[PDB]
């Protein structure tokens, strides 16, 4: 998702294309017309390049970090992959 949504007004705007896309996405996720039956999932390797208005409560607000495992995690994975 970091390839589309980036901080508004920082880059050259992809020739005025990226800003419009970000605005459209923000308007659709939460706007005047209310939705209650959607779930959006995003995945990225560069979390620091994402817009700050898209990571607020009422928007993509549950942020999680997946890191290296410890001995128990490695044991669980090895049990998974040799069953």
């Amino acid at each position: 998702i970091d390839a589309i949504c980036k901080q508004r007004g920082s880059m050259a705007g992809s020739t005025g294309v990226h800003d419009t896309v970000v605005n459209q996405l923000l308007s659709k996720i939460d706007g005047v017309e209310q939705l209650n039956n959607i779930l959006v999932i995003g995945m990225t390797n560069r979390p620091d390049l994402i817009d700050e208005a898209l990571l607020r409560p009422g928007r993509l607000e549950v942020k999680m970090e997946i890191g290296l495992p410890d001995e128990k995690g490695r044991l669980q994975i090895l049990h998974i992959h040799t069953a």
Binding site: A12, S14, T15, V17
Partner: protein, 78 residues
């Protein structure tokens, strides 16, 4: 920043015709001629029907006359 964008222009393909003005006129002329021929045939057929109806009465009259004459002659003969 060599990110270009474009806009589009449209053109309309010629409408369905430019073959409907040479065979068309000939078709219309032939249709008119056929209509005139049909009218003439109508008139002639009506006249023929009238003439056949006229013939019928003379046919019936001659049949009746001959039958009556034959019966009368037979009656007098015997």
């Amino acid at each position: 920043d060599m990110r270009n964008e474009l806009e589009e222009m449209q053109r309309r393909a010629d409408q369905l015709a430019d073959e409907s003005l040479e065979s068309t006129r000939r078709m219309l002329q032939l249709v008119e001629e056929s209509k005139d021929a049909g009218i003439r045939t109508l008139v002639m057929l009506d006249e023929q029907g009238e003439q056949l109806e006229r013939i019928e009465e003379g046919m019936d009259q001659i049949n009746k006359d001959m039958k009556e004459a034959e019966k009368n002659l037979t009656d007098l003969g015997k």
